Amino acid sequence: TDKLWYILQELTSNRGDIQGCTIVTTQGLPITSLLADDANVSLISAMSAAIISVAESASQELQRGYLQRILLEGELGTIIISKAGPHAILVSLVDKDAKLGIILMLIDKAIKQIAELM
Amino acid sequence: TDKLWYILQELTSNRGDIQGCTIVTTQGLPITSLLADDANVSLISAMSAAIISVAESASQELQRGYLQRILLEGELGTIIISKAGPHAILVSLVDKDAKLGIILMLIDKAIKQIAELMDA
Numbered sequence: 001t002d003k004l005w006y007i008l009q010e011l012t013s014n015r016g017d018i019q020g021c022t023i024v025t026t027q028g029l030p031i032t033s034l035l036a037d038d039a040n041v042s043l044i045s046a047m048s049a050a051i052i053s054v055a056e057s058a059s060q061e062l063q064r065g066y067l068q069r070i071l072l073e074g075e076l077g078t079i080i081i082s083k084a085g086p087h088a089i090l091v092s093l094v095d096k097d098a099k100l101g102i103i104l105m106l107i108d109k110a111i112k113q114i115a116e117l118m
Numbered sequence: 119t120d121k122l123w124y125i126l127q128e129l130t131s132n133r134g135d136i137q138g139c140t141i142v143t144t145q146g147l148p149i150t151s152l153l154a155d156d157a158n159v160s161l162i163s164a165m166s167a168a169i170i171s172v173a174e175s176a177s178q179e180l181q182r183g184y185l186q187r188i189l190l191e192g193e194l195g196t197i198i199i200s201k202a203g204p205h206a207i208l209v210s211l212v213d214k215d216a217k218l219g220i221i222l223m224l225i226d227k228a229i230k231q232i233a234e235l236m237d238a
Contacts, residue, residue: 047176054172055190058165063211064192071190072173076183079176093182101219 008034011110017098048081048091085115126152129228135216166209203233
């Protein structure tokens with residue numbers, strides 16, 4: 001759990017554009033988190049897991065293959081939910097005006113590391 | 119419908135890594151499409167609308183505001199689902215290695231035009 005949180009530290013602080021992060025089980029249980037005290041870790045975890053289930057089915061049926069990552073771009077912020085091996089998911093809360101390419105690079109690196117640790 | 123299909127024609131012809139497009143209602147019904155003969159239009163439209171609804175509920179619950187765009191990346195390809203005003207949704211199937219910068223620029227232009235044409 002410690003090295004996971006340090007992966008999250010790396011990811012989060014490479015730029016102030018990543019608002020927060022959490023590593024969660026595939027079925028919505030938070031493993032570790034780097035989030036504001038006020039944030040709702042449990043709801044973020046459960047919603048991300050549910051979205052991943054739905055998007056997994058849709059990805060496979062939409063000829064896209066196995067789901068790797070899904071971005072939800074809202075008017076106030078972005079949520080990037082990435083598969084980090086078959087046992088974990090990485091949820092990244094991202095500023096609306098963030099540079100998407102940099103963040104996707106950082107998330108790729110963090111995913112590789114997390115999947116390694118699992 | 120003709121103007122919307124011309125928007126799709128421009129979008130899809132500007133990029134070879136855009137596999138196909140469709141403009142669908144919020145209820146998942148195809149308004150118009152420029153898709154390969156192999157594609158299942160009704161399935162693509164309905165699943166895009168369903169993804170949109172579920173992720174919208176989630177985003178709003180997590181206080182990220184109204185959902186504007188979804189990018190779903192799979193091992194074999196990507197699908198981009200963009201709100202084009204409150205009445206339409208643009209679905210874009212693109213290659214696994216597509217150039218997302220230019221594609222998202224073109225999609226922004228296309229959704230602006232679609233929303234213009236739908237605000238009647």
